[PDB]
Amino acid sequence: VRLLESGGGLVQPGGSLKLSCAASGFDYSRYWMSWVRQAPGKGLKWIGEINPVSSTINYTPSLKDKFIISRDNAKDTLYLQISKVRSEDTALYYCARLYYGYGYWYFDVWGAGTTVTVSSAKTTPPSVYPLAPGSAAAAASMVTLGCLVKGYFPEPVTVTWNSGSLAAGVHTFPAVLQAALYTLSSSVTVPSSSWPSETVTCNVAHPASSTKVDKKIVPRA
Amino acid sequence: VRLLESGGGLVQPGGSLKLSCAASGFDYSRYWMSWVRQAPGKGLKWIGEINPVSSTINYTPSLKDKFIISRDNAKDTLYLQISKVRSEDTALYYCARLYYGYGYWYFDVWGAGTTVTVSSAKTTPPSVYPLAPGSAAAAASMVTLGCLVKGYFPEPVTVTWNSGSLAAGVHTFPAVLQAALYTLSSSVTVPSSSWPSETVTCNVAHPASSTKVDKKIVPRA
Amino acid sequence: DIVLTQSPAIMSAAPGDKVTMTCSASSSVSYIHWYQQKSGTSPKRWIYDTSKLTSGVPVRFSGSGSGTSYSLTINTMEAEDAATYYCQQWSSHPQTFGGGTKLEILRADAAPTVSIFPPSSEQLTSGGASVVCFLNNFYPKDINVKWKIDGSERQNGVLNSWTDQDSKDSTYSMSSTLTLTKDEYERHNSYTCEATHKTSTSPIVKSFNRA
Amino acid sequence: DIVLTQSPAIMSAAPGDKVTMTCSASSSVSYIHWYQQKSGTSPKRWIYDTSKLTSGVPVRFSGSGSGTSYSLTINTMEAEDAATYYCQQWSSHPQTFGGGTKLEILRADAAPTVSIFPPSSEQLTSGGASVVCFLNNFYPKDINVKWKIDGSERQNGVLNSWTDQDSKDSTYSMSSTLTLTKDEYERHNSYTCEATHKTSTSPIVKSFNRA
Amino acid sequence: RRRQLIRQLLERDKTPLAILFMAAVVGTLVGLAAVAFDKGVAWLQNQRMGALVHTADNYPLLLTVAFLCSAVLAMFGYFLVRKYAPEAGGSGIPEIEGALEDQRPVRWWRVLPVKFFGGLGTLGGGMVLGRAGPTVQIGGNIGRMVLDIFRLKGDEARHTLLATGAAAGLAAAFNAPLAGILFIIEEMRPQFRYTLISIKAVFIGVIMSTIMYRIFNHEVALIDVGKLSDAPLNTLWLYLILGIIFGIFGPIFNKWVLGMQDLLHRVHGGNITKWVLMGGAIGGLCGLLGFVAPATSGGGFNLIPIATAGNFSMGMLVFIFVARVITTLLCFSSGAPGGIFAPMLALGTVLGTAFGMVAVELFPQYHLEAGTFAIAGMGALLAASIRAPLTGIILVLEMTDNYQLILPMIITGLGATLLAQFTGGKPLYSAILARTLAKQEAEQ
Amino acid sequence: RRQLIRQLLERDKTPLAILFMAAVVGTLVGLAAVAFDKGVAWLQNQRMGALVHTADNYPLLLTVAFLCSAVLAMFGYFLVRKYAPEAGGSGIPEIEGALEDQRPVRWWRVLPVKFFGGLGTLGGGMVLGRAGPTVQIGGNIGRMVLDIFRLKGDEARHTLLATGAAAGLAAAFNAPLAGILFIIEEMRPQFRYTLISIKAVFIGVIMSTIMYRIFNHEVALIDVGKLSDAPLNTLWLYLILGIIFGIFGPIFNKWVLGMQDLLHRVHGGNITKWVLMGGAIGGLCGLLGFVAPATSGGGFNLIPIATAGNFSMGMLVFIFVARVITTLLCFSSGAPGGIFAPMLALGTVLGTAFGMVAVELFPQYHLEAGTFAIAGMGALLAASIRAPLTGIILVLEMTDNYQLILPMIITGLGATLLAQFTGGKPLYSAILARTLAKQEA
Ligand SMILES: [Cl-]
Ligand SMILES: [Cl-]
Ligand SMILES: [Cl-]
Ligand SMILES: [Cl-]
Ligand SMILES: [Cl-]
Ligand SMILES: [Cl-]
C-alpha cells in the first residue's frame, strides 16, 4: 500500500499546476481520496475530497475554482488543479486515503507529498564553498569541517559526505532565504587524525538547477 | 470492452517470445482468459487458459514448457511465452475472454490478433510508393488512386487513408511474398472533383519494423 | 479431443436462399458454439449452446444439432453473411474447433474497372520499377490479366493478388504488379494492362507511355 | 469549522516519563483523531475515535476526552516518541486539525561546540565573503550568538539558522553566518564569534585574524 | 404431556416421500409458468412499441394507439376476470392466503387460465401492477391442480402443495428462492394456528422453479445496482428515521388502496360493462403515460436502478413518487388482475433515494451515498404496508446483493412496522382477506 | 370464520412493553456475547505467552501446552457439575425445551456457569463452538429480565426467551438474519402454535448485532472474497455433495450421541471422574493446539484456508477425521461448549475436498474447489441438526457469495433429504428427547 504524489514544484504567481497522486497497494475504488496541505512551519489544512464515482467533491472554504479535485480510477490516480496560485499556496501537498472507525472519518494512509513554491524569483544553481578550519586551527581530538551552499533557488539541496559513507557527525542547517536566493551550510565533525590525512568531501545536489558538485575540504594554506 | 494483444512478430527457430494482451472495458478478475491461434489459412487451435487467481492453467496436448500462460491481474494483462519455437508456431495469436451459457464454456470476446512468424529473416521496414494516375489521366467522375507497400518482413502492414477518415472505396490486397520479402498495394477510389483539390494520404504501419509512414498522393507533375 | 468437422468446406448460394452448414463431432458433444469470421477480423461469437443467437445476431440465423451432429442455418441469407463460420465444442476437454465453412455469395455480373499506374518517381530512384495495375470490383472472380510491354507478351516478374469477396457488395478486386529494373523499364515505352472477364468479349486494356 | 487548538505548543520531558497534551475544540466534537509526524515524514494515523490505538501504536500511547476537550497521553514516553502530534476532528464538516504539539526528548544541559571559519578562498574570488560560525550540539535550545568585527559589535548581514532537535543526542545545533563584500571584509582583521548559552556564565568566543 | 413430546421430537422431519416428490412437480410447473407469464407480458409491451414507432409521425395518432392498445388489452383482462373468475382480479395473495386456512376455494380450473391470460392484458398493456401476486396465486393453483390430479390426501398434502406452489411462484418471479420461502412462513401461512405445512417440501418446490427461471433468464439480474458504499454506525440512526417515515406512511397508503377500491366500486356498481370499460379506461390511461412519462406508468422495476444511482433529481423523484402513488392505487384498487407487491418496491426505492439526497447534503461528513437509503427502503414500504419485514429485507438482499447494508435494511424495515403498528393500519394483505372473507358472509 | 376475520384484523399488535423488553434483552445478550468472545480469546492468548516462554524446552512446552488447557478445562467441567448440570453441553437442547415449558431457566445459576464455564473449555482450546453457549446464555438473559420486571404472560416468556436466543446466535456469528431464521425453524416449539412475537425477536437480534458491531467492526469472521460462480451444468455436483452429507448426517449423530454414553462410564456420574476426565480431554486439545492446530481449537480460522484450496487432499482428510474425533471427544464429553461452529469447519473441509475432486474430474466445468467448500459449510448442519434454512442463511450471512445460493440450497436440501431417508433426526431435538425422557423415570 503506497500513495505517491508528484506534480509539485515551482510556479509563478497567477499560475496553475496539476498535482498528481498515484495509488498502489489497494483498491482505488471503495475509497474516498482527499488532499491536505502543510505550509512550511504551519499545520495541516484540508483542501478537498472526492468520493469513488466522483459524484461528490468538496473543498475547504475557498472560492469557486481555486481548486479542482478529480480522479481517474482507471489509473488509480488522484488529481488536484490549483489556478491563480499565490504565496499562500506554497506548502507541502499530501493526498490521503479516507476511512473511518465508528463513522467519524479519518485520514487513513498519507503520502510523502509534493512541495509547491509559488514565486517570481528564478531558478538558480548554488555555489558550494569549502569551510576548512583557519590557519590557527587548534587541532584537538575532533575536527569540525563543513561546506557552504549559497545562492540557489528553489528548495531543496541535498548535502551528504563522502557520499553518505560518513553519516555520523553530520549537520545540514535549514536553508535561509534572502534576496530571492537560498543559503545553507553543512557541518561534519570527525576525528582529527581522520581528516587532513584522509579525504573529506561534501557532495551537494540541486535537482532544479540540474546540478551536482563535490567540494573537497582541503586545509587552509 | 477491448482486448488488445501485442508481442507478436519475427523470431528465429528455437527462440522465445512473450506475447502480451492488455484488457480494458471490463473486470479482468472473475474472468477466465485464454489463447487460441490461427495458422495462416488454417483454422483455430486452442492453446491454453488461466483462471482468475491463476490457481489453474491447462494447455493443449503440448510439451513441457512449449507454452507458459500467466496473467498479472494487477495490469489486467494476459501473457503467453513460447519457447523453442518452430514453423508450426507461425500463426495469428488471439487472446479471448471466457464465459458460458448453460455452462459449456465458449470463447466470449476475442481480441485483435498479433502475428508471430518464425524465420531467420530480418525485421525489415517497408517502402511506400504513391500510385498517382499517369499524365494521360482520363479524369472521369471517379478517380482511383492508391499506394504501393513493398519490401517488408514480416506480416502484417495496416493501410488506411487520411487516417481512416476515408473508408469507403478503399482496398488493400493480400500481401504476396517473394525473395523473403512482402509486397502489397492499396486501392482507394474517390470522386475526381474531390482528389487533386484535396489531400489524399495513405498511412502505412509496420509494427514489427516499428515504422509508420504517410505517403501523400500527388498528381504526376 | 473431439474431432469437429464442418461439412461444406466452401459453399455458395444467392441471398434470400436458405443456407445450412453442418458440423459433426467424432464422438459426442452438446451445446455447440459458432463463431463468424469475416476477412480481416478476429472471430465473433455468433450462436451458442447450440442455438442461442448472441446479442446482435440477426434473427436470420438459427442454431441446432444434437450430440453427434449439429448445424447452423440462415433463413434467407443476406450478402453481409459472407464469411467463415467455425463451430466449436467444449462439452469435452480440451475444447475443439471445426474446420470451418466459407460462405460465398452468388450475385449478378459485375465487370471490372482497370487502372494502370506508372512506377512512382521515388521507386525509380533506387533501381526499382513496379508497374501496378488494379482491377476493382468485378464478379465473378474469374478474371484474366495480361501484360504487354511495347506491344508484346510478358509474364516474367508479374504478380497478382485477389482480395476476398466483399461483405457488402459481394464483388472481387485483384491487383496485378509487374516489376522491373529501372533500366529494364526505361528501355521501353508502351506498358499495357489487358483484363479479360466474363462481363465483356473484348478485353479491357489500359496502358500508358513513358514518352 | 471547528477551531481545534492543541494546548502545549511545544514541550519536553525525559523518556520513561508520563506526558499529556491537550486539544480543545471551539465548539463540540466527538471521536477525535491523532496523527504523529516525525521530521521528514508525512503524518501517520496514531490514535482515533478518541482512543483506538492504530495497528502498531505502542500500547504506551493513550487517547481520551469528550465533546469540547480531549487529550492524548504516553505512559513512559520513549525517545522514539519525539515528534509532532496533530489532533483532528470531523464530527463537524469541514474537518479541522489542531495547531499541533511538539514532543522533544528533554535532556541534560550541553555546552555548545563553537567552530569558526574564514571565508573560502573561492568565494573571495567573486566579491563575496561569508564568515560562517557553527554552534554544534547544545541544550537547551536557547543560545545567543553575537559577532565582533575588529573587536566591535555587528548585526548587519548576519544570518542564523537552528536545526531541529537531533533525533539521537537530542541536542540542538545552530549556525550563524555573517556576509560581507570582499572589500568590506578585507578592510578588517579580527573576526570573533561569541556564543552565550546557559551552560556557561562567560560566553564562548572563537575568532580568527586575516593577519 | 412430556410423554407425547418426547415421542414427537423423535418423529421430527419425516415428510412423506410422495408429498416431497410432488412439491417438485409443483415448483417445476410454477416455474415454467412464472416464465411464460414474464415472457408473454414483455412480448406484448413490445408490440406496443412497433405500434407507437409505426405511428411516430402523427403525434395525435400515437397518443391514440398508446391509449387504445393498453385499453383494449386492459379490458380483455378485466373481462376474463368478472366473467370467469372474480376471485382472480386483484393481488391474488389474499385469496391463496385465505385458502390456506381453508377459507376460500382454489378454482384452479378457472383461475389459472384467467389470472394468467388476464394479467397478460393488464401487465402487457402497461398498468401499474406487479407480477408477484399474479404468479404466487397462479402458483398455489398449480400445486392444487396436482393435489387433485393425483388426489393426494391429508391436509399436509393440501397445505403443503398449496404453499410450495406459492413460494415456487414468488421465487420464480423475483428469482429469489430464500424470499419465496421466508414469505410463505412469515405471511402466507395461517397466522394463528399450528399447521401441516412441510418446509423441506416448499424448498424443493422453490428450487425447482428457481432453476426453471435460471434456464430462461440466464445471465441478467432483474435489478443490477453494483456494490454500493458501506454504512458506518454513526449513520445508522438515519435509517431508523427513514423507517419511521415509512411506518406512518405505511397504514395511510393502505387506507387509500382500500378505500380507493371502494370509491371505485361505485363507477361500475358491480356491472361487468361498467368495469371492463372502466378497465380499458385506466388501462389506455397507463399506456399513454408509458410514452409521455414512463416513470409514472408500468411496472416500476426499471427505474429502481436509475433511482439508486442518483440519476433522478429531487424534483423528478417527488414527481415519480406521487405520480406512481396514484397510478398504483388507481390500477390495483380498480380490481385489475395484477399485483401491488413489485410496484411497492418502486415506491420504497424512490422514496428512499429522495431521503438519501437530503441526508447527503445534510451531513457531508457521513460521506453518504443516497443509493444506500434507496435500498434501505426498497422493501420498507413492504414492511409497513404488507408488514412482511423479513420477506422484504431478504427479497431485497436476494436481488440487490448488498449484504453490507443488512444492518441498515433491518433497522429501517423494523422501524417500518414499529410505526405501521403504533399508528393503526394492518397487514394490507390480511385486511383484504378479512374484508373479502367478511363480505363473503354479512351478505346473507 | 367470524373469529378469523376478527383475528386477521388483530394481527401484529405486540405489547409495547414486550417489544421494549426484547431491546434490553438483545442489548444485554450482545454485550455478553462480546465479553464471552473477547475473554475466550484473551485466554488463548495467555497460552501463547506461556508456550513462547517455554519455547526453548520442547517437552516443557508440550507440558504447559497440556496443563494450561487441562487446568482450565477442568475448571469448566467443575463449575458445571457442581453448580449447573443443565449447562454442560450445547445449551440449545435446554433452551429449546424450555421454550415448550419442559425445562427450567436457572439463569441465576446458568449465566455465571456457562459463561465462565466456557471461558475454560474454549479459552483452553477445546473443539467446542461458542454458538450454543451464547444462544443459551441468551434466553437466560431474556429470562432474567422477564423475572426482574415480572412482565406476566406466556407471550412475554416465550418471546423474551426466544429473542434472547436469536440475539444470542446473532451476536455470535454476527448474523442477524440467521439468529432470527434459527428460532423460527428450529428452537420454536415444533408442534403447536406459539405466543412468540417475531417483531420482538428482530429488535432483540438487532440490538445485539449493533453491540457486536460496536466492538468488532472492520473485520469479518470468515473472509473469503467473491468466489467464482456456478453454471447450471455443474449444479448436480452440489446435489451429490448434499447426498453425501445426508448419509453421513445421522451417522455423526449416532457417534455424538453414543460417544456421550460410552463416555458416561469413565466417570459414572462422579464429579471427580468428570472434572479430571475434563482437563484430560482439555489438556489433550491444547497439546494439539501446538502440534496440529487444525485438529484442535474452534476450527473457524481454517475455513478460509480450506476454501482457498490451500490444504492438500491429504491434509484435508487428516484434518477431517482428526476434527471428527476431537469434536466428539470434546462435545460428547459433556463439556460446556457447542458443536455448532465446529460442525461448520467439518462441512467446509469436507466440501473443499469434494471440490478438488470435482475439479480434476471435470476440468471443462472450470470449477473452483472453493465453491463446494461453501456449499457444505452449512450442509453438516443440514444433516446433523437438520436446520437447512438457518444454515444456508448463516453461511451467506458470513461468506457473502449469494451467487452460490442456488447451489448452497441444492446441497443442504439434499443433505436433509438423505439425513431423513436414512434414519437420523434433529441432533438437537434428539438430545432434548433423551434429556427429557431420562427425566421422567
Ligand atoms: Cl386482492
Ligand atoms: Cl406484484
Ligand atoms: Cl400482489
Ligand atoms: Cl447438548
Ligand atoms: Cl457452537
Ligand atoms: Cl451448540
Side-chain angles (χ1 to χ4, degrees), chain E residues 90-92 94 432:
Chain E
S91 160
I432 293 183

mmCIF file of all heavy atoms in Angstrom, chain E residues 90-92 94 432, ligand 1:
data_model
loop_
_atom_site.group_PDB
_atom_site.id
_atom_site.type_symbol
_atom_site.label_atom_id
_atom_site.label_comp_id
_atom_site.label_asym_id
_atom_site.label_seq_id
_atom_site.Cartn_x
_atom_site.Cartn_y
_atom_site.Cartn_z
ATOM 1 N N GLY E 90 -57.173 -8.704 -8.861
ATOM 2 C CA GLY E 90 -56.547 -8.129 -7.690
ATOM 3 C C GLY E 90 -55.307 -8.937 -7.406
ATOM 4 O O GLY E 90 -54.988 -9.866 -8.150
ATOM 5 N N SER E 91 -54.608 -8.580 -6.337
ATOM 6 C CA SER E 91 -53.386 -9.273 -5.935
ATOM 7 C C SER E 91 -53.419 -10.766 -6.220
ATOM 8 O O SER E 91 -52.724 -11.256 -7.112
ATOM 9 C CB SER E 91 -53.132 -9.073 -4.444
ATOM 10 O OG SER E 91 -52.267 -10.075 -3.946
ATOM 11 N N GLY E 92 -54.229 -11.485 -5.451
ATOM 12 C CA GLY E 92 -54.328 -12.917 -5.629
ATOM 13 C C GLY E 92 -53.732 -13.595 -4.423
ATOM 14 O O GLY E 92 -53.978 -14.775 -4.177
ATOM 15 N N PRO E 94 -54.241 -12.497 -1.177
ATOM 16 C CA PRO E 94 -55.252 -12.592 -0.121
ATOM 17 C C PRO E 94 -55.997 -13.906 -0.269
ATOM 18 O O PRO E 94 -56.161 -14.635 0.702
ATOM 19 C CB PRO E 94 -56.143 -11.383 -0.385
ATOM 20 C CG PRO E 94 -55.181 -10.385 -0.896
ATOM 21 C CD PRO E 94 -54.371 -11.211 -1.885
ATOM 22 N N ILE E 432 -57.359 -7.368 3.423
ATOM 23 C CA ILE E 432 -58.074 -7.663 2.190
ATOM 24 C C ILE E 432 -58.809 -8.994 2.311
ATOM 25 O O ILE E 432 -59.898 -9.160 1.768
ATOM 26 C CB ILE E 432 -57.108 -7.693 0.978
ATOM 27 C CG1 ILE E 432 -56.569 -6.282 0.722
ATOM 28 C CG2 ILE E 432 -57.824 -8.234 -0.260
ATOM 29 C CD1 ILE E 432 -55.684 -6.172 -0.480
HETATM 30 CL CL CL G 1 -56.518 -8.733 -3.965
#
